[PDB]
Enzyme design. Sequence first.
Site, PDB file in Angstrom:
ATOM      1  N   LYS A  22       0.859  -1.176   0.000  1.00  0.00           N
ATOM      2  CA  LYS A  22       0.000   0.000   0.000  1.00  0.00           C
ATOM      3  C   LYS A  22       0.909   1.244   0.000  1.00  0.00           C
ATOM      4  CE  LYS A  22      -1.782   1.912   3.854  1.00  0.00           C
ATOM      5  NZ  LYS A  22      -1.601   3.390   3.720  1.00  0.00           N
ATOM      6  N   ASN A  23       1.945   1.198   0.833  1.00  0.00           N
ATOM      7  CA  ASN A  23       2.872   2.312   0.972  1.00  0.00           C
ATOM      8  C   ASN A  23       3.864   2.631  -0.142  1.00  0.00           C
ATOM      9  OD1 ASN A  23       1.095   3.361   2.823  1.00  0.00           O
ATOM     10  ND2 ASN A  23       2.292   2.736   4.595  1.00  0.00           N
ATOM     11  N   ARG A  91      -4.083  11.943   5.002  1.00  0.00           N
ATOM     12  CA  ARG A  91      -2.992  12.903   4.996  1.00  0.00           C
ATOM     13  C   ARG A  91      -1.924  12.678   3.919  1.00  0.00           C
ATOM     14  NH1 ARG A  91      -0.820  14.986   9.499  1.00  0.00           N
ATOM     15  NH2 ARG A  91      -3.046  14.839  10.103  1.00  0.00           N
ATOM     16  N   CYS A 115      -4.236  14.105  13.469  1.00  0.00           N
ATOM     17  CA  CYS A 115      -4.349  12.676  13.180  1.00  0.00           C
ATOM     18  C   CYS A 115      -4.296  11.973  14.537  1.00  0.00           C
ATOM     19  CB  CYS A 115      -3.250  12.153  12.225  1.00  0.00           C
ATOM     20  SG  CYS A 115      -3.130  10.349  12.148  1.00  0.00           S
ATOM     21  N   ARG A 120       1.966  14.794  13.655  1.00  0.00           N
ATOM     22  CA  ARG A 120       2.462  14.457  12.323  1.00  0.00           C
ATOM     23  C   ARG A 120       2.519  15.659  11.372  1.00  0.00           C
ATOM     24  NH1 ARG A 120      -0.365   9.165  10.085  1.00  0.00           N
ATOM     25  NH2 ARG A 120       1.530   9.278   8.740  1.00  0.00           N
ATOM     26  N   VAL A 122       4.012  18.395   8.565  1.00  0.00           N
ATOM     27  CA  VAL A 122       4.631  18.185   7.267  1.00  0.00           C
ATOM     28  C   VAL A 122       5.649  19.271   6.958  1.00  0.00           C
ATOM     29  CG1 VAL A 122       2.621  16.927   6.445  1.00  0.00           C
ATOM     30  CG2 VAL A 122       2.729  19.425   6.145  1.00  0.00           C
ATOM     31  N   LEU A 124       8.833  19.295   7.091  1.00  0.00           N
ATOM     32  CA  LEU A 124       9.936  18.813   6.265  1.00  0.00           C
ATOM     33  C   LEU A 124       9.652  18.812   4.772  1.00  0.00           C
ATOM     34  CD1 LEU A 124      11.626  16.325   8.740  1.00  0.00           C
ATOM     35  CD2 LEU A 124      12.212  18.722   8.335  1.00  0.00           C
ATOM     36  N   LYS A 160      15.012  15.234  10.359  1.00  0.00           N
ATOM     37  CA  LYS A 160      14.468  13.967  10.855  1.00  0.00           C
ATOM     38  C   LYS A 160      14.459  12.957   9.721  1.00  0.00           C
ATOM     39  CE  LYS A 160      11.141  15.799  14.296  1.00  0.00           C
ATOM     40  NZ  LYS A 160       9.831  15.472  14.960  1.00  0.00           N
ATOM     41  N   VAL A 161      14.418  11.680  10.066  1.00  0.00           N
ATOM     42  CA  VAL A 161      14.333  10.671   9.038  1.00  0.00           C
ATOM     43  C   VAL A 161      12.831  10.690   8.723  1.00  0.00           C
ATOM     44  CG1 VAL A 161      14.572   8.247   8.455  1.00  0.00           C
ATOM     45  CG2 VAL A 161      16.250   9.350   9.994  1.00  0.00           C
ATOM     46  N   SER A 162      12.473  10.999   7.489  1.00  0.00           N
ATOM     47  CA  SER A 162      11.061  11.079   7.093  1.00  0.00           C
ATOM     48  C   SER A 162      10.693  10.394   5.798  1.00  0.00           C
ATOM     49  CB  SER A 162      10.466  12.487   7.197  1.00  0.00           C
ATOM     50  OG  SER A 162       9.218  12.605   6.508  1.00  0.00           O
ATOM     51  N   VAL A 163       9.867   9.362   5.884  1.00  0.00           N
ATOM     52  CA  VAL A 163       9.434   8.672   4.680  1.00  0.00           C
ATOM     53  C   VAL A 163       8.744   9.673   3.758  1.00  0.00           C
ATOM     54  CG1 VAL A 163       7.772   7.030   3.743  1.00  0.00           C
ATOM     55  CG2 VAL A 163       9.208   6.393   5.696  1.00  0.00           C
ATOM     56  N   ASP A 305       4.619   0.227  12.057  1.00  0.00           N
ATOM     57  CA  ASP A 305       3.428  -0.434  11.493  1.00  0.00           C
ATOM     58  C   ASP A 305       3.229  -1.895  11.959  1.00  0.00           C
ATOM     59  OD1 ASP A 305       2.416   1.971  10.287  1.00  0.00           O
ATOM     60  OD2 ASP A 305       3.480   1.515   8.411  1.00  0.00           O
ATOM     61  N   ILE A 327       8.838   6.323  16.878  1.00  0.00           N
ATOM     62  CA  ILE A 327       8.333   7.020  15.688  1.00  0.00           C
ATOM     63  C   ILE A 327       7.048   7.822  15.995  1.00  0.00           C
ATOM     64  CG2 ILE A 327       7.551   6.847  13.312  1.00  0.00           C
ATOM     65  CD1 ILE A 327      10.425   5.935  13.659  1.00  0.00           C
ATOM     66  N   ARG A 397      -8.930   0.608   4.941  1.00  0.00           N
ATOM     67  CA  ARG A 397      -7.972   1.494   4.288  1.00  0.00           C
ATOM     68  C   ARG A 397      -6.619   0.831   4.140  1.00  0.00           C
ATOM     69  NH1 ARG A 397      -7.217   6.998   7.464  1.00  0.00           N
ATOM     70  NH2 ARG A 397      -5.569   7.103   5.852  1.00  0.00           N
TER      71      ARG A 397
HETATM   72  C1  LIG Z   1       1.358   6.853   3.415  1.00  0.00           C
HETATM   73  C2  LIG Z   1       2.495   6.263   4.177  1.00  0.00           C
HETATM   74  O1  LIG Z   1       3.369   5.650   3.600  1.00  0.00           O
HETATM   75  N1  LIG Z   1       2.502   6.428   5.495  1.00  0.00           N
HETATM   76  C3  LIG Z   1       3.580   5.863   6.290  1.00  0.00           C
HETATM   77  C4  LIG Z   1       4.687   6.884   6.494  1.00  0.00           C
HETATM   78  O2  LIG Z   1       4.151   8.007   7.154  1.00  0.00           O
HETATM   79  P1  LIG Z   1       4.873   9.373   7.060  1.00  0.00           P
HETATM   80  O3  LIG Z   1       3.859  10.325   7.365  1.00  0.00           O
HETATM   81  O4  LIG Z   1       5.527   9.541   5.811  1.00  0.00           O
HETATM   82  O5  LIG Z   1       5.872   9.259   8.263  1.00  0.00           O
HETATM   83  P2  LIG Z   1       7.313   9.854   8.471  1.00  0.00           P
HETATM   84  O6  LIG Z   1       7.413  11.100   7.735  1.00  0.00           O
HETATM   85  O7  LIG Z   1       8.322   8.842   8.284  1.00  0.00           O
HETATM   86  O8  LIG Z   1       7.222  10.178   9.973  1.00  0.00           O
HETATM   87  C5  LIG Z   1       8.374  10.659  10.546  1.00  0.00           C
HETATM   88  C6  LIG Z   1       8.306  11.060  11.975  1.00  0.00           C
HETATM   89  O9  LIG Z   1       8.810  12.381  11.869  1.00  0.00           O
HETATM   90  C7  LIG Z   1       7.773  13.360  11.954  1.00  0.00           C
HETATM   91  N2  LIG Z   1       7.753  14.271  10.804  1.00  0.00           N
HETATM   92  C8  LIG Z   1       7.599  13.865   9.537  1.00  0.00           C
HETATM   93  C9  LIG Z   1       7.587  14.805   8.500  1.00  0.00           C
HETATM   94  C10 LIG Z   1       7.733  16.156   8.792  1.00  0.00           C
HETATM   95  O10 LIG Z   1       7.712  16.996   7.921  1.00  0.00           O
HETATM   96  N3  LIG Z   1       7.892  16.566  10.069  1.00  0.00           N
HETATM   97  C11 LIG Z   1       7.905  15.660  11.062  1.00  0.00           C
HETATM   98  O11 LIG Z   1       8.047  16.054  12.212  1.00  0.00           O
HETATM   99  C12 LIG Z   1       6.490  12.605  12.118  1.00  0.00           C
HETATM  100  O12 LIG Z   1       5.672  13.266  13.044  1.00  0.00           O
HETATM  101  C13 LIG Z   1       6.934  11.245  12.591  1.00  0.00           C
HETATM  102  O13 LIG Z   1       7.002  11.303  14.025  1.00  0.00           O
HETATM  103  O14 LIG Z   1       5.710   6.305   7.310  1.00  0.00           O
HETATM  104  C14 LIG Z   1       5.232   5.881   8.592  1.00  0.00           C
HETATM  105  C15 LIG Z   1       6.368   5.293   9.422  1.00  0.00           C
HETATM  106  O15 LIG Z   1       6.916   4.241   8.668  1.00  0.00           O
HETATM  107  C16 LIG Z   1       4.135   4.830   8.448  1.00  0.00           C
HETATM  108  O16 LIG Z   1       3.631   4.432   9.688  1.00  0.00           O
HETATM  109  C17 LIG Z   1       2.999   5.447   7.640  1.00  0.00           C
HETATM  110  O17 LIG Z   1       1.965   4.528   7.500  1.00  0.00           O
HETATM  111  C18 LIG Z   1       0.707   5.067   7.901  1.00  0.00           C
HETATM  112  C19 LIG Z   1       0.306   4.417   9.217  1.00  0.00           C
HETATM  113  C20 LIG Z   1      -0.355   4.834   6.828  1.00  0.00           C
HETATM  114  O18 LIG Z   1      -0.292   3.832   6.124  1.00  0.00           O
HETATM  115  O19 LIG Z   1      -1.278   5.640   6.637  1.00  0.00           O
END
Ligand SMILES: CC(=O)N[C@H]1[C@@H](OP(=O)(O)OP(=O)(O)OC[C@H]2O[C@@H](n3ccc(=O)[nH]c3=O)[C@H](O)[C@@H]2O)O[C@H](CO)[C@@H](O)[C@@H]1O[C@H](C)C(=O)O
EC number: 2.5.1.7
Length: 419
Positions: A22-23, A91, A115, A120, A122, A124, A160-163, A305, A327, A397
């Site tokens: 899905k991701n 989101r 959320c 969470r 954005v 970054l 931060k490490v951010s997907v 997850d 996380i 979802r």
């Molecule tokens: C759609 C999707 O792929 N979503 C996934 C992705 O979320 P993401 O949103 O990208 O996660 P992050 O940016 O890696 O989250 C990073 C961490 O860092 C903070 N942060 C993130 C971005 C930012 O700009 N500023 C900032 O502060 C944030 O708060 C978090 O604590 O990565 C998460 C962790 O692996 C998953 O749990 C999440 O799945 C979910 C369940 C789902 O399928 O819906």
Amino acid sequence: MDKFRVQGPTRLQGEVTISGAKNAALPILFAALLAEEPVEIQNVPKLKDIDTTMKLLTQLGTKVERXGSVWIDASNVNNFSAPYDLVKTMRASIWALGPLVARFGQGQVSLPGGCAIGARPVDLHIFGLEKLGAEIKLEEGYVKASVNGRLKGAHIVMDKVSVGATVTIMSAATLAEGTTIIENAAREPEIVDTANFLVALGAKISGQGTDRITIEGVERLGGGVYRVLPDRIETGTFLVAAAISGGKIVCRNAQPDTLDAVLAKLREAGADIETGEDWISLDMHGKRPKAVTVRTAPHPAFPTDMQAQFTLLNLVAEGTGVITETIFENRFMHVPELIRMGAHAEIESNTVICHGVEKLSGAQVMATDLRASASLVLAGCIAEGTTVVDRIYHIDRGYERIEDKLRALGANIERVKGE
Ligand SMILES: CC(=O)N[C@H]1[C@@H](OP(=O)(O)OP(=O)(O)OC[C@H]2O[C@@H](n3ccc(=O)[nH]c3=O)[C@H](O)[C@@H]2O)O[C@H](CO)[C@@H](O)[C@@H]1O[C@H](C)C(=O)O
């Protein structure tokens, strides 16, 4: 308002064919906004998030069709906004921003609000876009991005490490002028997938999968056919389902290398695991799991997850298991739900201390998280009696036909409508 009615206990046994991630499908669908020619994305799961993403794309003027694949034709994008009503339900919609401004010079996406999972922001994503030369403003709750001409390559270091931000920046950079370098990039398999999709389109990317990604922008991206990798979370969830039910299972269409931490944890739990090129087998030999200690963190470490799933495991395991979340510090909604079913645990800050019990009792529980809530359905399968899971729209979802897959494993589960 759908509900699952689960009758337990059940030993889960059999086979499951793993769906596409899905991701990976999500970021790839948004990335398809960059493609000037038709695109065929294979192995896309059938679940709510894909529906929402298809809807958002169509709202932009993208031509969309689906079955096992999703066919995208972004040749005629004519709208550049993602409305509140849409963003509020998902989101991840924020991913539409980068491709829009990179290819069209403009994009407007409703700023995500709260959320339940936790904080969470954005920031970054926006930071990354600005560093690329995009002008961004907030008006009426809408994030408005713009750039006159092409974006500009830049050297960016992630606070931060951010997907999410890694994908936003990486995606937008493929059309920028010059070279972009993302330092402290997220390493998730889904990021390697999205990068490979981009490369298949004509993009120049290297370092995907490492903490340093480098992109050389090109003038335009074409079209093509790309197969989405297997869903690691779906895979982990099924493996756990078998491990907590004294069961035996084989996962087909799997990618073992995306699961190291989870597999090692299952082994510690006492599971007998074998892996092949595209398959994973797990046999508990009818044994109760052993409590394990887990720490969530960025890939390849244990993923958030799979957190609730392992909390469940700990809850019916022998011994004291400890789960620490780094996380989403507040991603513990499932705990009081499981405690309603007779589990025992204390939450201290970002850590759950589990006191494994021999059996769970059926009860009414509430889903709230598209991935973690699957733990409630899993609990229902092994609990004594009947469990009723409310709000399954959440699970819808994040999982393709969870009832069907579980049922094919021996689970007694029914989708109840209204009643
Ligand atoms: C759609 C999707 O792929 N979503 C996934 C992705 O979320 P993401 O949103 O990208 O996660 P992050 O940016 O890696 O989250 C990073 C961490 O860092 C903070 N942060 C993130 C971005 C930012 O700009 N500023 C900032 O502060 C944030 O708060 C978090 O604590 O990565 C998460 C962790 O692996 C998953 O749990 C999440 O799945 C979910 C369940 C789902 O399928 O819906």
